[PDB]
Design a protein around this ligand. Sequence first.
Ligand SMILES: Nc1nc2c(ncn2[C@@H]2O[C@H](COP(=O)(O)OP(=O)(O)OP(=O)(O)O)[C@@H](O)[C@H]2O)c(=O)[nH]1
Ligand SMILES: [Mg+2]
Lengths: 180, 137, 18, 415
Amino acid sequence: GNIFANLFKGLFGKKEMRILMVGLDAAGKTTILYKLKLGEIVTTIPTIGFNVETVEYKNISFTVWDVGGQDKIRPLWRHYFQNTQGLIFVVDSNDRERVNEAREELMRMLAEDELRDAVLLVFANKQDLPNAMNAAEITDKLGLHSLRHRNWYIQATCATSGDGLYEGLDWLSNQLRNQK
Amino acid sequence: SKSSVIGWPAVRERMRRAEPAEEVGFPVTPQVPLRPMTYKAAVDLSHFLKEKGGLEGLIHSQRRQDILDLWIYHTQGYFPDWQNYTPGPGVRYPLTFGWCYKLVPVEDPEREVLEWRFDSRLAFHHVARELHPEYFK
Amino acid sequence: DRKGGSYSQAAGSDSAQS
Amino acid sequence: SASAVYVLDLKGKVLICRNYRGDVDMSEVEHFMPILMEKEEEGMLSPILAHGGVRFMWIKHNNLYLVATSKKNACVSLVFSFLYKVVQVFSEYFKELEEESIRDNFVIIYELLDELMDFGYPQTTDSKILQEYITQEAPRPPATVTNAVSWRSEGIKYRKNEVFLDVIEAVNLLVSANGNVLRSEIVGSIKMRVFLSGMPELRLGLNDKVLFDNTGRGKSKSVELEDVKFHQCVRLSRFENDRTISFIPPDGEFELMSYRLNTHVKPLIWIESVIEKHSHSRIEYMVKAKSQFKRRSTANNVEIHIPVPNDADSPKFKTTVGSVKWVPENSEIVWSVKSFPGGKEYLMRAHFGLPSVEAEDKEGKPPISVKFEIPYFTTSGIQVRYLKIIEKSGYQALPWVRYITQNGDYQLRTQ
Ligand SMILES: Nc1nc2c(ncn2[C@@H]2O[C@H](COP(=O)(O)OP(=O)(O)OP(=O)(O)O)[C@@H](O)[C@H]2O)c(=O)[nH]1
Ligand SMILES: [Mg+2]
């Protein structure tokens, strides 16, 4: 066999990668996806189903599949677990009562033998109010350090501003791609 | 028979080594003929054993007889069923006509000590057939 | 040759049983 | 006591019909198809149908159902035997059993049907004998049918006298899911292709346990055949008297005897398979095959069929020896091995995906069946002793035979 075509394609960029968009409802997941794809804070109705989009950055097609946090849609995250390489968790630091529910949902989704190669991607959504926690208090509460064989990274992103999205994208690219 | 002559010393040594008192399957040589030993073949084998020695006067044992039958089958393709002796107690004559070998007491027939003894009259007189006409059909 | 084992010649009768 | 032997098709059309008694109307065949459809759709379908006072007993062929209508209390076994004889005659005359020959060989088919059975009672069933009086390409009937010997035509002459035997073994093992074998029986099959001059009277002799005990040699390796079924040429009286297998071999290939005795030995091939099937995530097939047979024998064309999931897709096979291919038509993993030496150990690690949505209905657990075929290996240990070929004219025969060991109903129950 010959791999000249593959080498030529990789000389200018061939890897694309994937990503997931899961989390509690009203956690800034749809707004975060809109900012990543377009760059504006678009107001949308609650995600009854799901939203599928793609982001082109660093020569990698970062496809984002937004998943709602509805009770009827919480057990539907297993549908996107097939043929999935990445996973992004959107936390809701502004909902103290919903923090436990989000942590339980993340633990349930992280306790599947099929979703093992998807590294952890914790995004601190709603990073605009004083009640939002830091990048370590939320991780300590969620016990992200206790996830054996899981590469998790906590990043604070402001839905209104958009700061930290570039850092999160760079971290995801570095975790997915292991080349120069 | 060069092969028979070569195997006679090894067979005699193996029989002597075994005292008087692991692999599964039944492989068959491809194209090797298999048939019961004939009267002429039995007589020739008895004569060869008598001439070379090691069989006349040797203590009769199940292991030695089985080893001899296996060697004969390997070297000639004869089934190991013609080397049968008449039931005891006393002198046991060969079951197959033409065999010059017989078992005689050396001291229940099973506990009696028996040894191989050459007998040229076996190849001419059907002692085993006369003793057991039913077994001969 | 032949698959399933080479054919072998058979005897005529039990020569050891007379 | 069949009333009308007819041949149907896959669409319910009667390819050919031949009434023998006329006590059953020819229009009853039309109701056989609806009756069969109703029986199949309710689980009550049986080979013997019943249209009121007329019973439609027939077997299923390759492409048509040879249903034979009857009205009285006819022998069902006799009807089945007649149908089997007709199928064998058709196979001997026509290389294929399908609708392509029913509509093309009617001229000879009608003659064969008329000659085979008269008034519902068959009289001639030998294909070789029947080929001398009914041909598709007529002299007086041969004396073989009138004579007692109806399985060996007289006057057969050949340049050489060679008879080829085939001692085919059938290793059938019924291994339960717990790991133990329940039904482990080996059925012998002595098929011989006799090609000699004249009408020799073969005198088959083997190392039977009963024969060895009677002769007084019940101490060597003897085959303990629990059931022995001799052919028509084999004399039942001779076998019953003193275990004498004397019969006239036919002209061609035929089954002389069919031994059938239980087996208490370990299986030749031991399959240790595991199912690490995740709940709608993935599945693992840690299947290991251990050859318990002798190392001198090679199991040529070893095919251990591993039933994989029906809806499994994107499967990966991590084996050691032999090609592993998954056939979606059969819904199983075919562990095909070209040469399997005795004592070898092949390890396979299956890995296939599964859809997230669960199946609507259960699919069951089909047993794993191996297709090992080791030639020149007799599991039962039975060896041919002699073959008394006697001819009045006097000739030197050259008998031959080969031992073939294969797998019969060698299925392994799944967990
Ligand atoms: N004003 C403001 N609201 C935010 C911010 N971050 C998160 N939110 C809230 O989070 C919600 C985000 O909803 P969407 O963008 O439509 O998508 P989502 O996050 O998946 O929410 P659902 O569709 O209900 O599952 C908004 O309705 C906001 O109320 C922020 O930085 N500023
Ligand atoms: Mg949304």
